[PDB]
Amino acid sequence: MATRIAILGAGPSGMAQLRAFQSAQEKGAEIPELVCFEKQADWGGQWNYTWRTGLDENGEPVHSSMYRYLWSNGPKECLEFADYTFDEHFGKPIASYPPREVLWDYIKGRVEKAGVRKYIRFNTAVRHVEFNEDSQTFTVTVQDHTTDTIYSAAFDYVVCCTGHFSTPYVPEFEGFEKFGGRILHAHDFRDALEFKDKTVLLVGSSYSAEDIGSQCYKYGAKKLISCYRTAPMGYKWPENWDERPNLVRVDTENAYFADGSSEKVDAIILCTGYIHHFPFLNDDLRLVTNNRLWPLNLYKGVVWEDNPKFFYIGMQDQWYSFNMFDAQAWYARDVIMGRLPLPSKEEMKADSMAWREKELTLVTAEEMYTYQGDYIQNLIDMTDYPSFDIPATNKTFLEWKHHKKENIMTFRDHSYRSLMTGTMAPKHHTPWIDALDDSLEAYLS
Amino acid sequence: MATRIAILGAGPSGMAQLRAFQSAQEKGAEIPELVCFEKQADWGGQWNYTWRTGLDENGEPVHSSMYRYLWSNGPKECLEFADYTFDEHFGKPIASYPPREVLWDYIKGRVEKAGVRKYIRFNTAVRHVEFNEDSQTFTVTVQDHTTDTIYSAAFDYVVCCTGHFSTPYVPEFEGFEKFGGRILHAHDFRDALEFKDKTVLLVGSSYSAEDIGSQCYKYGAKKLISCYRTAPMGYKWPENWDERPNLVRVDTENAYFADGSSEKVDAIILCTGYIHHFPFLNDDLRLVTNNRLWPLNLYKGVVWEDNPKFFYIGMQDQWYSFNMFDAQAWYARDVIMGRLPLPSKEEMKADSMAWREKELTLVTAEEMYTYQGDYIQNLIDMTDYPSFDIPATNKTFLEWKHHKKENIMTFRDHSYRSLMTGTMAPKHHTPWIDALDDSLEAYLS
Ligand SMILES: Cc1cc2nc3c(=O)[nH]c(=O)nc-3n(C[C@H](O)[C@H](O)[C@H](O)COP(=O)(O)OP(=O)(O)OC[C@H]3O[C@@H](n4cnc5c(N)ncnc54)[C@H](O)[C@@H]3O)c2cc1C
Ligand SMILES: Cc1cc2nc3c(=O)[nH]c(=O)nc-3n(C[C@H](O)[C@H](O)[C@H](O)COP(=O)(O)OP(=O)(O)OC[C@H]3O[C@@H](n4cnc5c(N)ncnc54)[C@H](O)[C@@H]3O)c2cc1C
Ligand SMILES: Nc1ncnc2c1ncn2[C@@H]1O[C@H](COP(=O)(O)OP(=O)(O)OC[C@H]2OC[C@H](O)[C@@H]2O)[C@@H](O)[C@H]1OP(=O)(O)O
Ligand SMILES: Nc1ncnc2c1ncn2[C@@H]1O[C@H](COP(=O)(O)OP(=O)(O)OC[C@H]2OC[C@H](O)[C@@H]2O)[C@@H](O)[C@H]1OP(=O)(O)O
């Protein structure tokens, strides 16, 4: 086919985008030339673990925010590919909340099967994307770190897949320049063992704080302190872990909270989340948003409204994840291919405004993942992407919510049914708190 | 003047470039318009300390490599402005090896005096510099993080001052993904107290290894271990500090050397240096070199030979430093202003080749700083920058060498005379090992 496409990033989303085109071709259609650029030496994005921190071996910002002993925080059943099942990949049932290495193996399995590795240029950082009015094409400039060469190439469309949980939001507190312990962001957190026998303040009250706390807890930290800005997380933590209102300052050794309280602290971890940052785009192409279920300026959450030859995959906040990226990649594919022509700019705006109105109505966690599910439904209904039971995927989310509330440290110890196959997942061979080994090999025997 | 100049960065180099222009104007010349861009909230470069690590508050790679308790490692007398003396800044003699905050105050003071702040756009990262063949102008694209806007602007010349000790060289050793302590690069080193009562592996044998060990030692580390790749540093270290051949792998808790030895380690600090990295340049403009006294492709060490309307300040390795940047900035100024016209491309090449042949001749630390002083001498002779006594600066380095050999932990306790004023620096009020407070106010009272 005539056109040429650039895919930025080879994590879940970039992988999904390649997989969609490969599926079209398998079903016998003529597809566009495809070039995918990836700065790391392998695919999988967040899921590709690294010991590195800050800046990688080439000087690019280190991308992955993942740590030793990370395991899935939601049911694997909620993120199964509708076109490549857990049954198929592993050839047997496994429990509901696999470690990192395990879900990494599984996402790679689909793209190894699909043969799409050949499209990817690894160890290549994307530096600039420019749209040229005269030719109606994009110029993509990249740095190949294998050859140490900077070069560019022209493309008829561009799909951005570079993630939005990699560039840290890192607020400052009074005294950080005097504190003698380590200060780091959740993004920098690697092995919980570095904190065995220590007192660790975790600043913030979301998924980052919840899990990094647990890992420090699980691996012997003397004591834990979470501070919240708005409201407490609210779970019943173990004995040596307590919650209090915000940090307000720190000194050579101590932390002070709005409590009036205060104590000795050895390390501070900022679990204050991330920013959407696209250093390779100018203001004509660059999405500016806070983290949320509905960023503005994206038709069907995917098409950039000022230049609809540019697409974004996976830039919403994530209740659903892998199968959301699929539904987005299938939709992007079909517009690029001519199968779903775009409406007028006014029409896109009116649609996008109606989704945002509904977003702002949203109050409870249940209302939120359901909304995201209605979004996914609408996308998969437009595409030969296989439909699956979204209302039951939400009930699975509901269950998970209850398990977390019942007991924060044992939610991972439960099991759920695949919406793709029907099978119930078997209980894991070891309780969470005792499963100290994070390796694939030990999870599967 | 008709022309417009961009200065990239506002550390010592950027500061020196502005100051050079300011000086000419003060003596009555018409000067170009100047725009200087700086990604941090304030000037000073390495010398502007931050507690931050990896990526700053805006997503930009954090720039400074400086830690708590850093002091000058060479005689202040070797880095004094020939146009702005230590007497004039501080109003009174002071010792020879000032703490960071103290040299920071001193470099700002020249530029506060000069009134050149008004030329700087702070909190602005340079993304891209392109040369347009049609206009013979550069387009500079930047991101203003105050307004969150990306915009560009056209310049007749560009002076790059973004440094080369900020992007870390970070080799991998077998086992790093399995070790449970902190691994970090010298660039990420902040407060030595994070390592009180610990055993610390320091990988490397140069200025970073020397001085980061010494701070870990001075603030109460249990034990130190340096490993070298080529040759030992060879200084007499305290009892709990020992040197040995290179690291070769690591496990859950331990380090293994070529010794065949091995022991328990809590943290690893890669003191392996830095890479010249310019993400905002294509290959037509982009210097590529290892760290050394004579990079190729720079006429007089400063004019980019493939496009001589683009200049680099201070990209050499640094024995001299602040007065080298001034000699360079003064030279750049004069070429930009038309005072010193350039020879042909062939003659630049022959001249640079002659400097590289001599660079290769160099064996002893003395031959090296003498070569850099021959370099600086040839630069300052071309310009109204005030000549100063290089032979005598060299002798002050020689004295410095011997004191470090004599005793690595007390070289900071000596004093030397100013080549600018003649005055002998008084002994400091506290010996190094005991002066635990790094503050300007404590150093000055
Ligand atoms: C700590 C953490 C834990 C998480 N846990 C879960 C979980 O348990 N379950 C779940 O469903 N989701 C989880 N997530 C959600 C995560 O966002 C998705 O799982 C998924 O990783 C996002 O896919 P992506 O491909 O869109 O982005 P990413 O996985 O972030 O991939 C981005 C890719 O783009 C590349 N890239 C970026 N910039 C450039 C550039 N300039 N040039 C070249 N390449 C570039 C990166 O190398 C990377 O390969 C977690 C996220 C984090 C941060
Ligand atoms: C740990 C350490 C200790 C040192 N100690 C000494 C010492 O004791 N004595 C001595 O003489 N020298 C020392 N040095 C040497 C040091 O390089 C020089 O003194 C001086 O800092 C070099 O000045 P510079 O302006 O050329 O570079 P820098 O000080 O590094 O300045 C670079 C500037 O450019 C900015 N910049 C970079 N990229 C961008 C961009 N994309 N957009 C906008 N701005 C950008 C940075 O913010 C920074 O302000 C030390 C260096 C290090 C790393
Ligand atoms: N200054 C300050 N003081 C105290 N607290 C602050 C401050 N600034 C932000 N925050 C809190 O940090 C948290 C950020 O949460 P989140 O965005 O989900 O980020 P996560 O890293 O937890 O990522 C979650 C997602 O990534 C992967 C995972 O699966 C989820 O999809 C949240 O509680 C914040 O606001 P608030 O006022 O605290 O409500
Ligand atoms: N793979 C590996 N294994 C072990 N050791 C390695 C390895 N790779 C490099 N190195 C050593 O790291 C050190 C880097 O030296 P330097 O360039 O002075 O960087 P610094 O940060 O010390 O220099 C700071 C400079 O900045 C400012 C200061 O004033 C100096 O001018 C040096 O000893 C290296 O070469 P070698 O083979 O080890 O000799």
Side-chain angles (χ1 to χ4, degrees):
Chain A
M1 202 188 308
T3 62
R4 202 156 172 264
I5 316 305
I7 295 158
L8 315 186
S13 299
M15 296 159 104
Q17 197 61 264
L18 294 162
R19 174 65 169 169
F21 278 107
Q22 179 274 331
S23 284
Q25 176 180 71
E26 179 63 7
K27 285 173 201 216
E30 212 156 7
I31 61 163
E33 309 266 39
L34 312 170
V35 180
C36 173
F37 298 106
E38 170 54 65
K39 73 175 153 172
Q40 286 174 249
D42 208 359
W43 47 25
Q46 285 292 346
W47 307 88
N48 183 8
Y49 177 84
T50 177
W51 57 271
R52 293 171 182 281
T53 250
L55 267 28
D56 79 10
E57 88 264 23
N58 299 138
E60 306 304 331
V62 172
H63 176 76
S64 167
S65 278
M66 278 185 165
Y67 40 72
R68 306 291 326 264
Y69 333 126
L70 183 145
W71 294 26
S72 173
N73 14 70
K76 83 172 198 286
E77 278 76 37
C78 283
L79 91 220
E80 196 170 3
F81 298 137
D83 84 327
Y84 184 79
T85 64
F86 286 121
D87 281 338
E88 183 187 335
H89 171 69
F90 294 108
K92 43 128 149 178
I94 61 159
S96 280
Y97 295 80
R100 211 211 84 248
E101 206 181 347
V102 174
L103 283 187
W104 189 41
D105 193 75
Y106 166 68
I107 65 186
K108 293 181 283 169
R110 187 180 63 173
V111 291
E112 280 155 6
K113 191 189 194 189
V116 302
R117 206 202 175 71
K118 60 162 168 199
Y119 294 113
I120 302 178
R121 309 186 193 169
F122 295 98
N123 210 24
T124 303
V126 167
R127 285 259 168 273
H128 209 341
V129 173
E130 276 160 317
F131 179 70
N132 320 297
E133 272 304 349
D134 295 332
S135 42
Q136 300 274 117
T137 66
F138 291 88
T139 295
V140 179
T141 307
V142 303
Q143 174 156 202
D144 175 352
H145 291 293
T146 302
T147 61
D148 194 33
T149 278
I150 295 178
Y151 69 79
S152 75
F155 292 89
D156 295 280
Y157 298 87
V158 169
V159 191
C160 189
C161 294
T162 54
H164 64 96
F165 296 130
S166 283
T167 302
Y169 179 61
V170 196
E172 191 166 64
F173 293 84
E174 202 194 307
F176 271 4
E177 67 290 14
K178 281 143 162 190
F179 183 68
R182 179 173 176 201
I183 307 195
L184 70 149
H185 183 277
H187 175 73
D188 302 315
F189 178 65
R190 289 275 180 290
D191 198 324
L193 289 188
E194 157 190 349
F195 302 95
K196 197 172 181 301
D197 299 321
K198 282 128 140 231
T199 313
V200 174
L201 175 63
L202 295 152
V203 177
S205 65
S206 188
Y207 302 90
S208 245
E210 285 171 21
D211 207 73
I212 290 168
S214 302
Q215 308 291 338
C216 291
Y217 170 79
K218 179 165 152 161
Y219 291 72
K222 182 184 284 152
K223 193 195 205 286
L224 302 181
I225 325 171
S226 291
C227 58
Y228 57 93
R229 174 176 61 186
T230 308
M233 287 177 276
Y235 301 111
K236 196 56 211 297
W237 307 107
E239 252 208 324
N240 58 335
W241 183 342
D242 78 86
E243 272 204 272
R244 61 192 84 188
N246 214 10
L247 179 67
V248 314
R249 85 181 165 92
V250 125
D251 61 26
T252 287
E253 287 171 72
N254 299 305
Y256 302 66
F257 306 76
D259 249 4
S261 86
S262 132
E263 78 202 74
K264 205 265 186 325
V265 148
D266 293 316
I268 305 159
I269 307 183
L270 300 163
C271 310
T272 32
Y274 300 88
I275 67 199
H276 288 69
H277 172 71
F278 309 97
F280 49 78
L281 308 175
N282 301 341
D283 286 358
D284 52 335
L285 296 178
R286 177 193 150 238
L287 172 72
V288 175
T289 190
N290 62 312
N291 196 32
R292 62 188 302 153
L293 290 167
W294 195 259
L296 214 58
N297 224 255
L298 308 165
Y299 183 55
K300 305 292 190 184
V302 156
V303 186
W304 177 245
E305 285 174 341
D306 293 337
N307 186 345
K309 283 161 132 263
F310 199 92
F311 307 81
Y312 279 103
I313 312 295
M315 295 291 162
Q316 293 70 20
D317 192 17
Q318 274 150 41
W319 287 91
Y320 285 79
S321 64
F322 298 168
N323 55 50
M324 183 166 69
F325 317 135
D326 281 12
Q328 304 175 138
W330 262 247
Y331 175 71
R333 177 194 69 185
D334 275 19
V335 4
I336 293 168
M337 279 181 76
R339 282 159 186 201
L340 291 161
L342 258 16
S344 84
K345 193 181 158 152
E346 277 185 25
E347 282 173 294
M348 289 185 303
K349 250 70 187 90
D351 190 268
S352 288
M353 164 167 83
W355 282 86
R356 162 62 66 82
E357 287 171 340
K358 199 79 167 68
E359 187 203 32
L360 292 164
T361 264
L362 268 20
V363 192
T364 69
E366 193 185 354
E367 281 168 332
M368 290 171 179
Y369 55 71
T370 302
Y371 174 90
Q372 189 158 85
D374 290 321
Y375 163 61
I376 295 171
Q377 188 67 69
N378 174 269
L379 288 183
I380 68 181
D381 292 344
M382 296 190 301
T383 264
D384 78 340
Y385 197 80
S387 77
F388 62 91
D389 191 342
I390 278 140
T393 305
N394 306 326
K395 281 314 103 37
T396 311
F397 279 116
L398 180 67
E399 268 193 85
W400 168 79
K401 260 290 134 156
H402 286 137
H403 294 165
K404 275 181 74 155
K405 250 201 150 93
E406 286 168 12
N407 184 3
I408 198 67
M409 299 289 158
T410 64
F411 74 81
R412 298 195 149 93
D413 283 316
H414 305 269
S415 262
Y416 314 90
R417 45 168 26 94
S418 158
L419 299 321
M420 314 295 161
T421 61
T423 61
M424 259 288 294
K427 188 200 160 53
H428 190 43
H429 68 49
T430 308
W432 173 68
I433 185 97
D434 302 299
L436 242 50
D437 195 335
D438 64 358
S439 86
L440 160 327
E441 183 181 276
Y443 180 90
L444 290 175
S445 69
Chain B
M1 245 190 295
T3 73
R4 205 158 171 257
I5 316 299
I7 292 160
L8 312 175
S13 283
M15 294 163 114
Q17 196 59 261
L18 290 162
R19 168 67 172 177
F21 275 103
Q22 187 271 324
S23 274
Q25 176 177 68
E26 179 68 3
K27 287 170 207 221
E30 206 141 22
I31 59 170
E33 319 273 28
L34 310 163
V35 174
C36 172
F37 298 104
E38 169 56 60
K39 73 169 157 169
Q40 289 167 250
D42 203 5
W43 45 24
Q46 284 284 352
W47 306 89
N48 180 19
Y49 176 81
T50 188
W51 56 268
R52 293 185 179 279
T53 240
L55 259 35
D56 67 19
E57 87 262 44
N58 292 137
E60 301 304 333
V62 164
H63 177 79
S64 175
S65 289
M66 290 193 161
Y67 35 72
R68 312 287 323 266
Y69 330 128
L70 181 140
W71 304 16
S72 158
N73 11 72
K76 88 175 190 276
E77 279 83 17
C78 290
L79 90 217
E80 179 168 29
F81 303 118
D83 76 327
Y84 185 75
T85 69
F86 284 110
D87 296 332
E88 174 184 356
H89 174 62
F90 295 107
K92 49 120 154 165
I94 63 165
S96 280
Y97 295 87
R100 206 210 87 239
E101 211 196 336
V102 174
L103 296 183
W104 189 37
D105 197 80
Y106 170 66
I107 72 190
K108 304 185 270 191
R110 181 173 69 168
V111 292
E112 276 144 1
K113 195 194 183 190
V116 312
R117 218 184 162 89
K118 56 175 185 182
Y119 298 124
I120 307 169
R121 303 192 192 164
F122 293 97
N123 211 23
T124 297
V126 177
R127 301 260 158 261
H128 207 350
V129 175
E130 279 156 314
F131 183 67
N132 319 285
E133 278 299 348
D134 305 336
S135 44
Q136 295 288 115
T137 69
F138 298 89
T139 300
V140 179
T141 313
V142 300
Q143 178 163 199
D144 177 346
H145 294 289
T146 306
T147 60
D148 196 31
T149 285
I150 295 168
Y151 72 75
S152 65
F155 292 85
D156 294 288
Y157 300 82
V158 181
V159 183
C160 187
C161 299
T162 51
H164 61 102
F165 297 134
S166 283
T167 301
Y169 180 66
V170 205
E172 196 174 59
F173 292 82
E174 183 192 331
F176 274 8
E177 66 289 10
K178 274 168 173 168
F179 178 69
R182 184 178 176 189
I183 314 174
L184 72 141
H185 185 273
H187 171 79
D188 310 309
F189 183 67
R190 288 296 179 264
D191 194 315
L193 302 177
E194 151 195 353
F195 304 108
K196 187 172 187 317
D197 303 322
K198 281 151 162 206
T199 318
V200 178
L201 186 44
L202 294 151
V203 183
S205 66
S206 186
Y207 305 81
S208 266
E210 290 173 17
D211 200 270
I212 287 165
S214 306
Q215 311 286 345
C216 285
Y217 167 81
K218 173 177 172 171
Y219 292 69
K222 176 189 293 147
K223 187 196 211 307
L224 296 191
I225 318 166
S226 291
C227 59
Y228 54 86
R229 173 178 65 177
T230 313
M233 303 186 240
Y235 297 111
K236 202 61 224 324
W237 307 111
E239 269 211 338
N240 61 330
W241 186 336
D242 77 82
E243 262 204 89
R244 68 184 73 171
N246 216 14
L247 183 59
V248 319
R249 90 190 160 94
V250 133
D251 57 29
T252 278
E253 278 164 86
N254 293 300
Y256 295 76
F257 314 81
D259 243 0
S261 70
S262 135
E263 77 211 68
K264 197 274 188 312
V265 162
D266 299 306
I268 306 181
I269 305 182
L270 300 166
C271 301
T272 40
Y274 295 93
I275 57 176
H276 283 66
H277 170 69
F278 311 97
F280 50 86
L281 299 186
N282 307 333
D283 282 359
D284 57 332
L285 290 185
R286 179 191 150 235
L287 180 61
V288 173
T289 189
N290 57 318
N291 191 34
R292 64 195 293 162
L293 298 173
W294 192 263
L296 208 55
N297 226 238
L298 301 172
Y299 182 58
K300 300 289 196 197
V302 164
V303 179
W304 175 243
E305 307 181 323
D306 278 335
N307 186 331
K309 275 160 136 271
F310 191 99
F311 310 76
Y312 283 95
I313 309 302
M315 287 304 166
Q316 288 73 18
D317 185 18
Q318 275 152 35
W319 290 89
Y320 291 60
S321 72
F322 301 168
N323 53 41
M324 178 164 68
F325 317 141
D326 288 6
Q328 301 175 140
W330 261 244
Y331 170 72
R333 179 195 79 192
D334 283 10
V335 348
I336 286 168
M337 278 176 81
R339 295 157 171 196
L340 285 163
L342 259 9
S344 78
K345 201 186 152 142
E346 279 184 28
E347 308 170 71
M348 289 185 294
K349 253 68 172 106
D351 189 270
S352 295
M353 166 167 81
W355 282 89
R356 162 58 68 73
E357 294 160 338
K358 192 95 175 72
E359 188 215 23
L360 298 165
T361 267
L362 267 26
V363 189
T364 65
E366 186 179 353
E367 279 163 337
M368 289 162 187
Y369 59 76
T370 304
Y371 175 93
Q372 193 162 80
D374 287 332
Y375 169 53
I376 290 170
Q377 184 71 76
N378 173 276
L379 291 172
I380 67 171
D381 290 345
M382 286 193 300
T383 260
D384 80 342
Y385 194 80
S387 65
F388 65 96
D389 192 336
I390 280 142
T393 304
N394 301 322
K395 284 323 92 40
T396 316
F397 279 116
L398 177 71
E399 279 193 83
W400 175 73
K401 252 306 119 141
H402 289 138
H403 290 157
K404 273 181 87 171
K405 241 200 167 78
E406 281 168 23
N407 183 354
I408 193 65
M409 299 287 158
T410 54
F411 73 88
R412 293 181 154 109
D413 281 320
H414 314 261
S415 272
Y416 317 83
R417 66 176 3 106
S418 162
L419 294 318
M420 309 301 168
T421 54
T423 52
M424 253 290 266
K427 187 179 165 69
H428 192 44
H429 77 48
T430 306
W432 183 68
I433 187 94
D434 290 304
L436 251 41
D437 195 340
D438 62 7
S439 95
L440 161 323
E441 176 193 279
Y443 179 98
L444 289 187
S445 83

